[PDB]
């Protein structure tokens, strides 16, 4: 079949894995978080690109795409412009995405997918994780720079 996640996305996902592993010091858990994120992105993409959503689900998915776009733009801007980062804004955007994803797949998928969604967002939407990622530490700042470079390319190309 075709490759469903491109190289730029894979680099972003790897950097998200690296900050998650730095934050938790649990390589297995960090791998599980990132694999669950990938699995849900792939499932959502298969249903979306092959026209499997009904009208209500499609409204939810388009809302999800708009929220993700806002999240991506905000994440990049909070990295670029000093003294603008707000962990509550990021956490709230992420939890909006979580809820819309739960709703979009509620008819197609089961509790296992809801658990994958919650496992991912419980980590990434955590306010202390976000404040550490955007904080003064050199390791986090270097990874965040790579994340934002990749996200900016995805935004520019139209994939976020």
Ligand X SMILES: CCCCCCCC/C=C\CCCCCCCC(=O)O[C@H](COC(=O)CCCCCCCCCCCCCCC)COP(=O)(O)OCCN
Q: Footprint of ligand X on this chain (CB under 6 A)?
A: 5, 9, 12-13, 16, 37, 41, 44-45, 48, 65, 68, 71-72, 75, 94, 97, 120, 124, 151, 159-160
CB of 48 to ligand X, least distance (A): 4
Nearer residue to ligand X within complex by CB, 4 or 26: 4
Q: Which bin fits 72, alpha (ψ -120 to 50), beta or left (φ > 0)? A: alpha
Nearer to ligand X among residue 27 and residue 45 (C-beta): 45
CB of 73 to ligand X, least distance (A): 9
Closer of 30 and 94 to ligand X (Cβ): 94
Residue that the structure tokens 């993700």 belong to: 68
Angle at 73 between CA 48 and CA 118, to 5 degrees: 55
- Determine phi and psi for 146, rounding to 5 degrees: -65, -40
Least Cβ distance, residue 64 to ligand X (angstroms) = 7
How far is residue 160's CA from residue 147's CA, in Å, rounded to a whole number? Answer: 13
Nearer to ligand X, 26 or 157 (CB): 157
C-alpha to C-alpha distances, 77 to 64, 111, 150, nearest whole angstrom: 20, 35, 13
- Considering only CA atoms, which of 44, 28, 20, 45 is closest in space to residue 125? 20
In the bound complex, what is the minimum distance in angstroms from residue 120's beta carbon to ligand X? Answer: 6
């Amino acid at each position: 079949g075709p490759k469903l996640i491109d190289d730029t996305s894979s680099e972003v996902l790897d950097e998200l894995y690296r900050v998650t592993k730095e934050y938790t010091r649990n390589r297995k858990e960090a791998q599980k978080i990132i694999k669950n994120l990938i699995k849900m992105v792939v499932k959502l993409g298969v249903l979306y690109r092959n026209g499997q959503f009904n009208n209500e689900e499609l409204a939810l998915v388009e809302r999800f795409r708009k929220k993700v776009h806002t999240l991506a733009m905000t994440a990049v801007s909070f990295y670029q412009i000093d003294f603008t980062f707000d962990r509550r804004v990021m956490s709230n955007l992420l939890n909006d995405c979580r809820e819309l994803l739960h709703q979009a797949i509620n008819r197609h998928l089961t509790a296992k997918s809801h658990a994958r969604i919650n496992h991912v967002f419980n980590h990434f939407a955590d306010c202390d994780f976000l404040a550490t990622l955007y904080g003064p530490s050199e390791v986090y700042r270097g990874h965040l720079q790579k994340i934002c470079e990749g996200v900016n390319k995805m935004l520019d190309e139209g994939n976020l």
